[PDB]
Symmetry: C2
Subunit: 31 residues, 2 copies
């Protein structure tokens, strides 16, 4: 729980996976 | 474009631009 930005990033990634975005598509975009 | 796909896309670009570490990505996966 380092920073407001890190907490928000964490929530966003979780939300995306919940919405149906694959893990592979996440990796493609952000890896 | 579908509104859902577009929102996901825009969230991804914002994440990328915000400086998401390689470790943070691994942790979320």
């Amino acid at each position: 729980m380092v920073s407001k930005l890190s907490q928000l990033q964490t929530e966003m990634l979780a939300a995306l996976l919940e919405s149906g975005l694959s893990k592979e598509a996440l990796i493609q975009a952000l890896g």
